[PDB]
Coordinates of N, CA and C in Angstrom, one line a residue:
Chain A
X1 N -0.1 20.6 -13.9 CA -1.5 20.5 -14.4 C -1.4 19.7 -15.7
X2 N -2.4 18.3 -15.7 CA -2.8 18.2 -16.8 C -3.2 19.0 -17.6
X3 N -3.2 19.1 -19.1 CA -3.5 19.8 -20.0 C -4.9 18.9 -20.8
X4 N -6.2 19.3 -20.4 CA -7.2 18.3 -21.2 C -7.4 18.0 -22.3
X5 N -8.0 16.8 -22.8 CA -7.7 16.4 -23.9 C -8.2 17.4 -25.0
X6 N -9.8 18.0 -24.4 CA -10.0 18.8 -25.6 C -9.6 19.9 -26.1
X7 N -8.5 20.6 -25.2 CA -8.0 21.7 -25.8 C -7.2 21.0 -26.3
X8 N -5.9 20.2 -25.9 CA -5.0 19.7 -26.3 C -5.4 19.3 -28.4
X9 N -6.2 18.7 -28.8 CA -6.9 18.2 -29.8 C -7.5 19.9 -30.6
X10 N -7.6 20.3 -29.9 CA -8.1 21.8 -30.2 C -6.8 22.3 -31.0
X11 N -5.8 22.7 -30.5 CA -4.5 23.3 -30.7 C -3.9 22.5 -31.7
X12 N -4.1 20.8 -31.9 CA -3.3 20.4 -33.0 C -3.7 20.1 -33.9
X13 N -5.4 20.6 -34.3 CA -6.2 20.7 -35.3 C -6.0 21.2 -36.3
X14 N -6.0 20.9 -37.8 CA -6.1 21.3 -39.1 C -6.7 23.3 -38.9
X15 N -5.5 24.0 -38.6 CA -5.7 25.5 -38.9 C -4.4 26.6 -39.3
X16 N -5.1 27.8 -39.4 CA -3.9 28.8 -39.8 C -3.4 28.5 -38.5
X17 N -1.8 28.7 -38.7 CA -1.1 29.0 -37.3 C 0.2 29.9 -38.2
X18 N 1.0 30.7 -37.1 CA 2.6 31.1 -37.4 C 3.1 29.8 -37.9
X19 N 3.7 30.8 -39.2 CA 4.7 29.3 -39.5 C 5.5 30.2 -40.2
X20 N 7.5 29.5 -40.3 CA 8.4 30.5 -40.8 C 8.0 29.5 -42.3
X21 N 8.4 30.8 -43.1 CA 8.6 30.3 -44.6 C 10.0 31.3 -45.0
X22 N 11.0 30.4 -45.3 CA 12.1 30.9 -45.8 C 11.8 31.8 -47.1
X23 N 12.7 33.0 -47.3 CA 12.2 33.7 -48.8 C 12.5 32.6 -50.0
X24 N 13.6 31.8 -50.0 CA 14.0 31.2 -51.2 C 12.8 30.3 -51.5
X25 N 12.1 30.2 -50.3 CA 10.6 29.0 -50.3 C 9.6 29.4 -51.0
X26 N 9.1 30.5 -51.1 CA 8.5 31.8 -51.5 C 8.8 31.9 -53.0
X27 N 10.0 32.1 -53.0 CA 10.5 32.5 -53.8 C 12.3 31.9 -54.8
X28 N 11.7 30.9 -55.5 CA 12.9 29.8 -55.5 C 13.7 30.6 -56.5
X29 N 13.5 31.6 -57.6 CA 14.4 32.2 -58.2 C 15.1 32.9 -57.5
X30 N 14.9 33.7 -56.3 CA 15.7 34.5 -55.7 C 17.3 33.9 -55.2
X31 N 18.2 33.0 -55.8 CA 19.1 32.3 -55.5 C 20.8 33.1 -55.1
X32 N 20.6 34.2 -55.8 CA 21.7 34.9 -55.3 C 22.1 35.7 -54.4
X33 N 21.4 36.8 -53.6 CA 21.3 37.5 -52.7 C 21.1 37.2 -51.3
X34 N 21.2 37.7 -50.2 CA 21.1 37.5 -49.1 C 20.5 38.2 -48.3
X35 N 19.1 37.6 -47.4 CA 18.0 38.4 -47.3 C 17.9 38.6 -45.7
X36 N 17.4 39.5 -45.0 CA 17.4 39.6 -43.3 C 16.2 40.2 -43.7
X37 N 15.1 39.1 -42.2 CA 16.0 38.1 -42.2 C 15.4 36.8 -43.0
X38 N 16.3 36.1 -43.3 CA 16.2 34.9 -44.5 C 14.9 34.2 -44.6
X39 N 13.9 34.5 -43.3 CA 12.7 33.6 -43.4 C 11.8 34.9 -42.9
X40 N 10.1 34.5 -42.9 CA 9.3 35.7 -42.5 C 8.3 34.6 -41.2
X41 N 7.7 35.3 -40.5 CA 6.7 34.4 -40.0 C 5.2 34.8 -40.4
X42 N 4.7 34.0 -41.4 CA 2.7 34.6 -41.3 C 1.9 33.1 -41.3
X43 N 1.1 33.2 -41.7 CA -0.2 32.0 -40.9 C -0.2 31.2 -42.1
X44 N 0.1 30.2 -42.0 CA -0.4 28.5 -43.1 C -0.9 27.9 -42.2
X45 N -1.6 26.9 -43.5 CA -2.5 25.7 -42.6 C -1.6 24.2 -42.2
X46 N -1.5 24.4 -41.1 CA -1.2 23.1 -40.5 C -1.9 22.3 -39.0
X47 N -1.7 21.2 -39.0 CA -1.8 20.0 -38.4 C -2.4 19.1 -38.8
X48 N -2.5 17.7 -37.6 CA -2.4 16.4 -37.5 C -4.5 16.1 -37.7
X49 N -4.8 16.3 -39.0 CA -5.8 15.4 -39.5 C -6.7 14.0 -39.3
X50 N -7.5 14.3 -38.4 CA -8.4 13.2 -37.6 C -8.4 11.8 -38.9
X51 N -8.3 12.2 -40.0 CA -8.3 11.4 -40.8 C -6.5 11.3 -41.6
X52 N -5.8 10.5 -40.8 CA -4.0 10.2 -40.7 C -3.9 10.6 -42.7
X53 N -4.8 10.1 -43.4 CA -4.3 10.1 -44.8 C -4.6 11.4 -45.6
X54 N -5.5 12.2 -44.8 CA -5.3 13.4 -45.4 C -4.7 14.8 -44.6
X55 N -4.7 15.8 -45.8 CA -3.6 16.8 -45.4 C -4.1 18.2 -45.4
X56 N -3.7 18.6 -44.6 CA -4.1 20.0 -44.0 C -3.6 21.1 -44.8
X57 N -4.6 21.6 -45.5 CA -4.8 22.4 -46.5 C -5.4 23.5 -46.5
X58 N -4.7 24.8 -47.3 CA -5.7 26.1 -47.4 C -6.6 25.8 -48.5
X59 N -8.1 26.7 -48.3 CA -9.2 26.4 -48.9 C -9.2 28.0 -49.5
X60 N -8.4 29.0 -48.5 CA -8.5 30.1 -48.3 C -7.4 31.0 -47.9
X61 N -7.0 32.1 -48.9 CA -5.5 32.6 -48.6 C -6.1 34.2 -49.2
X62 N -4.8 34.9 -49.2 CA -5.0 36.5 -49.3 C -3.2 36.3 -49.4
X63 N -2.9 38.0 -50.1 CA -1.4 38.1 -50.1 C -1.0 39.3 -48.6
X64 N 0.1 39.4 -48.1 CA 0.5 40.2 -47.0 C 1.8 40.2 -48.1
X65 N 1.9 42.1 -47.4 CA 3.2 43.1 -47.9 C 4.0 43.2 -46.8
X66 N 5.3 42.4 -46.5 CA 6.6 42.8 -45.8 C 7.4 43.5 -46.0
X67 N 8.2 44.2 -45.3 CA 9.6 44.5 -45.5 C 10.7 44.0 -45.0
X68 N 11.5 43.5 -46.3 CA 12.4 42.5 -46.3 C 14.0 43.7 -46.6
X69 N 15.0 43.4 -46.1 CA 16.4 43.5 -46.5 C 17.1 43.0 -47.4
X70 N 17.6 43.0 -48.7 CA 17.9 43.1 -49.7 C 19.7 43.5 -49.7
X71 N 20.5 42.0 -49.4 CA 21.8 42.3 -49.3 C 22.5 42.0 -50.2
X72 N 23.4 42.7 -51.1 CA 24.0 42.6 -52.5 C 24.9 41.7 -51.9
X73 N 25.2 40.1 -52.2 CA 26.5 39.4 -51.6 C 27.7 39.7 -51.8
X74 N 28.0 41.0 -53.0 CA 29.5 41.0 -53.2 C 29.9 42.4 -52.7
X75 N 28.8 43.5 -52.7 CA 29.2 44.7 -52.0 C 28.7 44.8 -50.6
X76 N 27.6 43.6 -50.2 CA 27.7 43.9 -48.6 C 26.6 44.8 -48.5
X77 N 26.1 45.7 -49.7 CA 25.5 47.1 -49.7 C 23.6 46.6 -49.2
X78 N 22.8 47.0 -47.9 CA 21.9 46.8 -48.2 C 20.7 47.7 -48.6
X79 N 19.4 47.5 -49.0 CA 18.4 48.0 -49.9 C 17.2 47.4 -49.2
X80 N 16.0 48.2 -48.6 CA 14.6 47.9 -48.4 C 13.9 47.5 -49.1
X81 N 13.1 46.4 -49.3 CA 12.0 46.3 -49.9 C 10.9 45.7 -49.5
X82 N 9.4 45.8 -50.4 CA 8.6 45.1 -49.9 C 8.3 43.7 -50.6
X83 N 8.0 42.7 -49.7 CA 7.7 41.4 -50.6 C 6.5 40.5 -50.0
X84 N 5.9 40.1 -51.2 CA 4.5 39.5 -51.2 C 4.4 38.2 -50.7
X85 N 4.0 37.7 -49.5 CA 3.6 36.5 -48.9 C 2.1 35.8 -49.6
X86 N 2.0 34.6 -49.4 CA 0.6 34.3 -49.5 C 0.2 33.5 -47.9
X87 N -0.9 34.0 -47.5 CA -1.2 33.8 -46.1 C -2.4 32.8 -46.3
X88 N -2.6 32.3 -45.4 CA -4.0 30.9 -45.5 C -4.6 31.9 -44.4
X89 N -5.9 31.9 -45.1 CA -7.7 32.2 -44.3 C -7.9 31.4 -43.6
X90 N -8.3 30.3 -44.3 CA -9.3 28.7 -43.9 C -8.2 27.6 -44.8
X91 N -8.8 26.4 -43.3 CA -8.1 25.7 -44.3 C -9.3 24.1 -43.3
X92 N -8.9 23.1 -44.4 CA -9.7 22.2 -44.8 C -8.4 20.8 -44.8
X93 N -9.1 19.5 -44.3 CA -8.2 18.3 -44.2 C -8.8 17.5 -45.8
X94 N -7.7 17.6 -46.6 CA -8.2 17.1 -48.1 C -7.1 15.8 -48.2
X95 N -7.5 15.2 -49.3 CA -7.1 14.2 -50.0 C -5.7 14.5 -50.9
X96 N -4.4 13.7 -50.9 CA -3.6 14.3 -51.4 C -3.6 13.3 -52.5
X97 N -4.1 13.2 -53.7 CA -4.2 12.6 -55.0 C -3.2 11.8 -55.4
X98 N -3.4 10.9 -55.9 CA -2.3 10.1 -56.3 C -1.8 10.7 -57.9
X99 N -0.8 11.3 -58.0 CA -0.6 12.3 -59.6 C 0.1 10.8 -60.3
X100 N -0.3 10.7 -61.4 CA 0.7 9.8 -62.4 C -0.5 8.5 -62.7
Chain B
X1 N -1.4 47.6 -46.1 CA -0.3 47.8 -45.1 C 0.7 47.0 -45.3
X2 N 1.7 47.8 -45.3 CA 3.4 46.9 -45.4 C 3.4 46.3 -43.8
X3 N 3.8 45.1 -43.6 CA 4.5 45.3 -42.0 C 5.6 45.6 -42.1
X4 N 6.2 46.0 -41.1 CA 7.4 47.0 -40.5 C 8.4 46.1 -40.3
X5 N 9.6 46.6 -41.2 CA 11.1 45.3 -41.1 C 11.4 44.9 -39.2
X6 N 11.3 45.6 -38.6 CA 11.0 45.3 -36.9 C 10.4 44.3 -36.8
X7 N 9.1 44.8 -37.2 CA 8.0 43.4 -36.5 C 8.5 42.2 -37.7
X8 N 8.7 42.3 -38.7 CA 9.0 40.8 -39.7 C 10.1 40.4 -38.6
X9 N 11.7 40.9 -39.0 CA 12.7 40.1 -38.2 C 12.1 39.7 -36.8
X10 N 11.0 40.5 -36.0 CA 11.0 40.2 -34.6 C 10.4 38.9 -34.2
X11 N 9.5 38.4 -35.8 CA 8.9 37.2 -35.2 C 9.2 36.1 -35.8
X12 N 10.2 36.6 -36.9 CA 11.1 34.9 -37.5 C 12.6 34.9 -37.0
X13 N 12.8 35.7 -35.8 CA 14.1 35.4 -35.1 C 14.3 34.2 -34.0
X14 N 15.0 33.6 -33.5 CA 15.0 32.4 -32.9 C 14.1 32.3 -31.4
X15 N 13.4 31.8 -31.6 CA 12.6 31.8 -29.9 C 11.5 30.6 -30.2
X16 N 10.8 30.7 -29.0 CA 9.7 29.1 -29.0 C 8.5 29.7 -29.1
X17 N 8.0 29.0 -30.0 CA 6.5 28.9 -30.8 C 5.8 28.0 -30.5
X18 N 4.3 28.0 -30.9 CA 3.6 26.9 -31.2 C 4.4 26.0 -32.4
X19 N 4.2 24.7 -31.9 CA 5.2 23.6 -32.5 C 3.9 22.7 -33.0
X20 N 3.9 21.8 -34.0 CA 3.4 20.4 -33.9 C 4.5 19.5 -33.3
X21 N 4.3 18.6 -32.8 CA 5.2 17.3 -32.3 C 4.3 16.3 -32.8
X22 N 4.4 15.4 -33.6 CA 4.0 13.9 -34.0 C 3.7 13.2 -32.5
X23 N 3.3 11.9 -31.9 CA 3.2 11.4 -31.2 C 4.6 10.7 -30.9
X24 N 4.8 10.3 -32.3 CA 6.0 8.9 -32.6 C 7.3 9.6 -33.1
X25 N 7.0 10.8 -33.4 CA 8.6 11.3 -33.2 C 9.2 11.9 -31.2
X26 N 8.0 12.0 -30.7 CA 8.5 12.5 -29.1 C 8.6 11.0 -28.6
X27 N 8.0 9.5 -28.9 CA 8.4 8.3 -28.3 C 8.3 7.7 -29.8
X28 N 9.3 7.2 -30.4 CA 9.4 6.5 -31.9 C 9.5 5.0 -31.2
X29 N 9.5 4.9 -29.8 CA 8.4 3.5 -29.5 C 7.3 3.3 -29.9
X30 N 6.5 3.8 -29.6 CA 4.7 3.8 -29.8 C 4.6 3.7 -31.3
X31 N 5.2 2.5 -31.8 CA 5.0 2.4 -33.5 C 3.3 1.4 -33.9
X32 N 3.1 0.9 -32.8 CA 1.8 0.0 -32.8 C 0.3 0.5 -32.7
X33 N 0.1 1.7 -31.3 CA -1.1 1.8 -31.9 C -1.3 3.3 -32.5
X34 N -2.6 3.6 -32.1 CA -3.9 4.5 -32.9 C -3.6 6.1 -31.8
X35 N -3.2 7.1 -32.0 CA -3.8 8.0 -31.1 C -4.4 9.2 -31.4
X36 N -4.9 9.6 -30.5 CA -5.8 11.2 -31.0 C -6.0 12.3 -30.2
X37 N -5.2 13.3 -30.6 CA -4.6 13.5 -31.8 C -3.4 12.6 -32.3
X38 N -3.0 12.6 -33.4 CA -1.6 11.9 -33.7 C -0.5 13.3 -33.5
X39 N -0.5 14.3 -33.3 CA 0.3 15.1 -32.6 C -0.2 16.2 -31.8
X40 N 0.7 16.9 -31.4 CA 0.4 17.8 -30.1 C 0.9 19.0 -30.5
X41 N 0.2 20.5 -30.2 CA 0.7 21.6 -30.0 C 1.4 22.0 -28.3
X42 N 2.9 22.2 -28.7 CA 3.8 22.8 -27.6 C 4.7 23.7 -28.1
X43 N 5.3 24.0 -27.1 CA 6.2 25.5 -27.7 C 7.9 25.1 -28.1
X44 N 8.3 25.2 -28.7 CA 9.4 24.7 -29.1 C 9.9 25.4 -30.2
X45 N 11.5 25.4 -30.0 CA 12.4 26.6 -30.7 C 12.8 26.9 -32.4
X46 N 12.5 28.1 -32.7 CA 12.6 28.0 -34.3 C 12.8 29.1 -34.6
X47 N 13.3 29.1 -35.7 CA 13.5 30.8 -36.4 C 14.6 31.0 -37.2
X48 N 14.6 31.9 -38.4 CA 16.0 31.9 -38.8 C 17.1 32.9 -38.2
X49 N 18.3 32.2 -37.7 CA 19.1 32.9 -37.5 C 19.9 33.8 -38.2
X50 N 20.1 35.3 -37.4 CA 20.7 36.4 -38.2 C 22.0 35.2 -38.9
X51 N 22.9 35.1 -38.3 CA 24.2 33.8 -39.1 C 23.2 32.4 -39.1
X52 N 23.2 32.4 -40.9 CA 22.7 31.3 -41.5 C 23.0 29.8 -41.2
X53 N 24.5 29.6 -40.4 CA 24.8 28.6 -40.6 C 24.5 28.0 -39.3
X54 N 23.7 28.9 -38.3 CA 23.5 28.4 -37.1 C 22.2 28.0 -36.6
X55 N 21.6 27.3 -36.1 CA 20.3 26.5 -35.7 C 19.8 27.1 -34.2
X56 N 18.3 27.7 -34.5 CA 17.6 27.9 -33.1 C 17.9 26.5 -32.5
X57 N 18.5 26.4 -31.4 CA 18.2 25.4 -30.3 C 18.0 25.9 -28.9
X58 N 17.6 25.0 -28.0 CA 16.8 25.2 -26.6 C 17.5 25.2 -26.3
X59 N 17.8 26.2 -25.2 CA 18.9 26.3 -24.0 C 18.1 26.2 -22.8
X60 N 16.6 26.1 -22.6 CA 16.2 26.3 -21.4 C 14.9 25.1 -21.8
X61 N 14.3 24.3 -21.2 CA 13.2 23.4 -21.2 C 12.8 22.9 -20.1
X62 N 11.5 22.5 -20.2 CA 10.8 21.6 -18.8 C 9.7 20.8 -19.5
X63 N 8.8 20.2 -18.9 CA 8.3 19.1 -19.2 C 6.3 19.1 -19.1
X64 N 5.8 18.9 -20.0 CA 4.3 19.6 -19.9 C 3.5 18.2 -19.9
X65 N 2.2 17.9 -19.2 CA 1.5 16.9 -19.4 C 0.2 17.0 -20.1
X66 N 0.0 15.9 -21.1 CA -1.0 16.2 -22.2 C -1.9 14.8 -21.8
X67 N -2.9 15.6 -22.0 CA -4.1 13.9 -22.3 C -4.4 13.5 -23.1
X68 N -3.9 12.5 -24.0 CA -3.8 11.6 -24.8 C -4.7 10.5 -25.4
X69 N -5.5 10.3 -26.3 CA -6.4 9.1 -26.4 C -5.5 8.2 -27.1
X70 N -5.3 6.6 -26.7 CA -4.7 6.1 -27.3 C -5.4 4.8 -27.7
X71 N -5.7 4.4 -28.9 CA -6.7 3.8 -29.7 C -5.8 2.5 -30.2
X72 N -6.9 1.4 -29.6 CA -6.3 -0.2 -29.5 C -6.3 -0.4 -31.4
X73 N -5.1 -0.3 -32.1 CA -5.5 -0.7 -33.3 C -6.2 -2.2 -34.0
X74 N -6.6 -2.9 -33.1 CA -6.9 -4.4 -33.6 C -9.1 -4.0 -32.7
X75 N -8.7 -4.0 -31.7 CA -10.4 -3.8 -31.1 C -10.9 -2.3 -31.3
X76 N -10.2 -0.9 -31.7 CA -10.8 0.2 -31.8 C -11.1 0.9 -30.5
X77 N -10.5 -0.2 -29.6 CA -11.0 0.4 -28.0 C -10.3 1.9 -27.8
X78 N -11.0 2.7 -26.8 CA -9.6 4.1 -26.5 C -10.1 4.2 -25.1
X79 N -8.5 4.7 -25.1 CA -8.9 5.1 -23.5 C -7.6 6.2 -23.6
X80 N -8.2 7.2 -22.2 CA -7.5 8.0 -22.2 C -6.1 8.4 -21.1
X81 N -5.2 9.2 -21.7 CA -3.7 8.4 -20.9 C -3.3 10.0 -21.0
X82 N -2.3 10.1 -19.9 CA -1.6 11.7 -19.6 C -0.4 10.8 -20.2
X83 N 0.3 11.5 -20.9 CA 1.6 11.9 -21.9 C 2.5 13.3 -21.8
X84 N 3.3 12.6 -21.4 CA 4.7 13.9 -21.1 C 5.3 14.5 -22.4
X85 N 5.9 15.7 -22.5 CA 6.4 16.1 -23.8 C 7.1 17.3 -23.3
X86 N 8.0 17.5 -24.2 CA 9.2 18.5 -23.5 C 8.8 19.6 -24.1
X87 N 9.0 21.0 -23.9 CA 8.4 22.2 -24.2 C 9.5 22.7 -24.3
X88 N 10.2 23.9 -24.9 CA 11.5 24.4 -24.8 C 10.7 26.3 -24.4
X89 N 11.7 26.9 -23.3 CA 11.5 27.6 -22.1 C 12.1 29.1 -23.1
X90 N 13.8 28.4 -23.3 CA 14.7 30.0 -23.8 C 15.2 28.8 -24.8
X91 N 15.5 30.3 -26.2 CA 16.1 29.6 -26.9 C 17.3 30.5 -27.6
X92 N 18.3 29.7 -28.4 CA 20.0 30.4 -28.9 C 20.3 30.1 -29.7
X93 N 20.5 30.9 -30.9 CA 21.4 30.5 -32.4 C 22.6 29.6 -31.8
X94 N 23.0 28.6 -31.8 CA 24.0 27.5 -31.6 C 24.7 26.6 -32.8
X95 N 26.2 26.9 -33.0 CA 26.3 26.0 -33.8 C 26.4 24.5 -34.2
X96 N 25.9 24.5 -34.8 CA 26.1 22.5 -35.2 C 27.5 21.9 -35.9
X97 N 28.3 21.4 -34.3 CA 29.3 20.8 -34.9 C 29.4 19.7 -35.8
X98 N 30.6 20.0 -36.8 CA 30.7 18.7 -37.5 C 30.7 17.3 -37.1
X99 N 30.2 16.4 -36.8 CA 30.1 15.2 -36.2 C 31.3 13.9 -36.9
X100 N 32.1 13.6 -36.3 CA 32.9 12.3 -37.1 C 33.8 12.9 -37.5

């Protein structure tokens, strides 16, 4: 079965979808430890923008509470915790500025 | 609500998701014209593996057909075209050999 075009255009539209975000992504100080598992899955805005030069963007976010694994690299020893994602609501196809 | 270390690991562990695919990275021929969407939602393999040093890859795939607008970049004409794209089925932490 073909797949028609308008769903197809539907699905690669500028929206929240699952997306992994590594902790160190999240969280770039976290450099020493070793986390299970290393990435989380929640919802950002992505896709391919009717207009090629702009970029799929949240307009609209909230925070989500995980529990992440917390593995000491030198004792092996692990520890529970919770950690703070930022999730995208809505999201909007914007202009990516020229900085400088 | 915390989510539960279960459900976090169970949905950033390796398996097939909604993917974007570019147009021109599934045929990096098609460098000339216009299409719409410029990429496609399919399912394709991702996740962080429990061993970091190994890549979700597809062990199982088949082939899905998409309807396509593909837009004359010089006249603006479009017409519309079924387009093949590979979908990935099962997927497996695999290592990536050293190459050379």
């Amino acid at each position: 079965q073909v797949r028609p075009f308008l769903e197809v255009h539907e699905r690669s539209a500028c929206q929240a979808r699952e997306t992994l975000v590594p902790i160190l992504q999240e969280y770039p100080d976290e450099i020493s430890d070793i986390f299970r598992p290393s990435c989380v899955a929640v919802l950002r805005c992505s896709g391919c923008c009717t207009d090629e030069s702009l970029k799929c963007t949240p307009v609209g976010k909230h925070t989500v509470d995980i529990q992440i694994m917390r593995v000491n690299p030198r004792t092996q020893s692990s520890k529970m915790e919770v950690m703070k994602f930022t999730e995208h609501t809505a999201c909007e196809c914007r202009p990516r500025r020229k900085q400088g």
